[model samples]
Target chain A: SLEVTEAD
Target chain B: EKRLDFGLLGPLQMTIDGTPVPSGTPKQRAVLAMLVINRNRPVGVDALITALWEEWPPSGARASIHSYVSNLRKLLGGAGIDPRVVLAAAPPGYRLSIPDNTCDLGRFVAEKTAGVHAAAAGRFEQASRHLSAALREWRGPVLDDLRDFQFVEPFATALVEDKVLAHTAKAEAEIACGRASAVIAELEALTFEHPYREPLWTQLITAYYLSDRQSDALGAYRRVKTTLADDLGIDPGPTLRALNERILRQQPLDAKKSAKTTAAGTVTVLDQRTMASGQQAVAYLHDIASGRGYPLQAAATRIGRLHDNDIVLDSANVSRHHAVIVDTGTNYVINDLRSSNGVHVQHERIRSAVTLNDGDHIRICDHEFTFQISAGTHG
Candidate 1:
């Protein structure tokens, strides 16, 4: 989830 | 966030990066929902088509692609980082490669890492800055667009998390320092997420540091009402604790006034108690320049501190030492002389200066100013 947040 | 004001500052983060983005209830959610889905793609062809509801999807995608590209660059400009450097032109997609551990994302990561690692940190500084950085990304919960895919839900959650973590870090940073820097951002943040306790706490902290005590207290009351109305829950423990602290500080100030000696002067008779002696000179080590060098003490009304206490009297006036206030903790004594004047220990100090422990402050044609405690109590 954190990674995706970093992505978006 | 009790301000019925425009710009619904999200609870996740109190402010936006550059400009004020409003979360206008339904409008904000609509925009945020759409962008959350198709934020970073080389073309977002399929995603854009779906987002546009397949109704004139091609034209809509083309237009949005152009708009987003421009907006993306604008976003980069906001952070002073070049927009071109942020996006990578890959084969099947343009991706936001905002530099590993350097982009706003990485900056946030670093901040949080530093804060958490230093758990003894103050929450107000850390939390407020975290909020500002995290909220900076949300230009009002994503501007309304056409798409609404279920997959976007996950993306939104992730985005929210990233923003949330960054804000948390900011709040902590602000507690450490930089409360004033987050004020503009806080206005929008409170607007969007009026019911959030931490944001309110953050706002209060900033106000407190800036000496806006009443406003800080009023913010807490407003948040209490909003939270109760929206979720039927009271504010979190943190907010309540801060409110209590503010009240206590106020009361303490009142009591201290009754006992505090207004005619306080900073001077000690014994030469040994001198934290500084001679013309009172200290070394100036510009960390930017990475070296400590000699400098003289210049300026009238030299402000010094004994230990968490203000040194009221100082001789000679210079540029660097003109306005001295108790920054709470101890800092090096300074010399504020410019050009043809103020020298300490026979060394001519150019520009401003900073001193470490065991430093000297000096003035031209003046004997050493021995920093001593006031002899007001002795017979």
Candidate 2:
């Protein structure tokens, strides 16, 4: 549910 | 047996010795190296034929590689002192894989990783010592009597990267609680890698924790200049964050901030954005799934999910697509089916298939050709 950094 | 692998692989390798190949060694080493690189096989076949290599090459490989299968060595030892381990296949054809034996590069990695684990367990003394041992392994590259290019170049790169990682681990440990103990060593590291943010962070931590705030700031200034000149890019997020943490009024948070607890954080590389040209295809064998196949072994090991030694670019389906595979015996490629699927060249099957050398895999939107030879064509 959590995508941290910039590049996904 | 403090039991490293029982905790690790349970003495998984048939043997853990180093290179034992002399004559038989040379032949298999050559073939294995080439087979690892697909596409170029057609051209590589000509090259091998020119060199007069024969099927006898495999025989040499088997026999020599067989000798190191731990006739008596137990696999799971606490410290792993060479009595029993997988890489120590001291038979023939073994090119690299030794501790300061032939190449300092191998020795450096061995020491570095060992130091990292030691530091993880809070063994700062051992960490410092191992880092010291690793640093002793490098003594210039490109000094050889003309070995194969595929093998030589990749090996050199891995060795260098390993060296950098090891240095980071050791420096991280020293800054944590061992700064005073490893003062001499830290001094050397700071001088050698002045710009590295991690190193600077450690220097700042050591300064602040030891009540030398001015020195910590000095280290930061030095790093800022280094980053400006060398990388022409800002510090990595990890470094920049660490710097800010150190400079904040909350000096008490220094220990918590300098926590090197996470290094293997997986950063997903966006191959999707990398322009899907005519993609190359190849199927991987699931049998040797965990093993770092040709690429990793040759320092060309791929990240993400791996096939043998080489790494697969399109690990996550949502990123890239289109793959191809020519089924042959011996190697089995299994599809995990994350978001996208592995598109077999012949048919879009839902299961795994055995690909020989020159199979093509077109999955998602990209294309890949398994040129198990020398030069297949493009990426």
Candidate 3:
């Protein structure tokens, strides 16, 4: 599986 | 009472009574898209004026918009459209009345809404069916062929997010339904494509963990945390951080587990990031020599002179095994590795371990670094 990264 | 369908989920398309009706000029089709998007609801005349021009509406703005709408009504009528699905006039604007499920975007929302409700009710099997069907509605990028219009931005952005929302729902439902490996490939690429989308990452990790790839799940968390800090200089949201902690402890990542760990709820970054701010502590080790600090992105971070450590410190004064930072959930604690000089924090070398705060300085061997929470956002 992969990852989650959130940018503002 | 008739066959009238509009498809804005792909290139702007309209079909009525089994006949493909050509949408006129880009401006004309854009007007139709606006109407269909707000189907059965009045789209203010000013909205169309601004959408067409975006700014500085021409002197004939109202007339130009009116002509577009006027043409649409006649075009549909000529195509033998449903009488009830009228491009009718209303106060301050026009309203295009099209029934639900008559449009691709409409169908997607309906199906997706049903799927989400089903998932919430603990009906993953039924939810997966609805969610999978929801995803199938996308023929391509929302209004892909109509990207030239100013109004496409808002609609496309929201619609695409909804598309991914279904992806997560389907993936979660499948995973919980004993098919974790079924979505592994898609989740992998989705996280790559949507690097900052937290829910995608959450489901991806769940898939990996359930597939018995615990190490890969933990590795995924570190990768995201690193890139997020390196780029946005922010911490992983609380849901992600909390999930990472559970994976490290080899806890169950089943469907029943609540998302109480999520602070405010980062369900989607489509809107403002709320509820998860400042919940997780992400520290960076600023090495004076390099004048650059490396992010301690992983939950249980390792630091040493060797490249094998989660964070590599290349300094002669440093020990092969320098120190490790353990996230005790409530606080981050830095432990001494019994290296040559040991781990010194706030000017005092600790005998064993020490708790870390927002800004703490540590000296190891000939290298000195500051442990500061690098939670600054993108400028």
> Which candidate tops TM-score?
3
Please give, for residues B1-379, the per-residue lDDT of candidate 1 as tens digits: 1111112122211123534443333322333333322224243334334433423444455565556556544544455555565544455544554232323333444444444433333344444444454455354442223125322332333344345434434444443453444443654464355445354454444445444455555565565556655764454566455655656566422211211121011111112223344422222322122232222221112232112112222223322222221110112234432322343432544234333233233333332342222211222
DockQ of each: 0.02, 0.02, 0.03
Clashes (candidate 3): 2
Fraction of real interface contacts that model 1 preserves: 0.00
The runs of at least 3 residues in candidate 1 whose Cα sits more than 4 Å from the true structure, single-residue gaps closed, are: A1-8, B1-147, B178-192, B202-206, B209-212, B215-219, B229-242, B245-379
Model 3, residue B42: what's the lDDT?
78
| Chain A TM-score for each of the predictions | 0.10, 0.29, 0.25
Scanning candidate 2 chain B in windows of ten residues, the lowest lDDT window is B5-14
In model 3, the runs with Cα more than 4 Å from the true position are A1-8, B79-85, B256-379
- For candidate 2, give the lDDT of residue B62: 41
TM-score of chain A of 2: 0.29
Candidate 2 residue spans exceeding 4 A from truth: A1-8, B1-107, B142-151, B180-211, B215-231, B235-239, B253-379
Model 3, span B69-175: residue lDDT tens: 77787778865654335888887588887786888877876677666556666777897899888888888877887898744654455454556656876887787
Candidate 2, residue B304: lDDT: 26
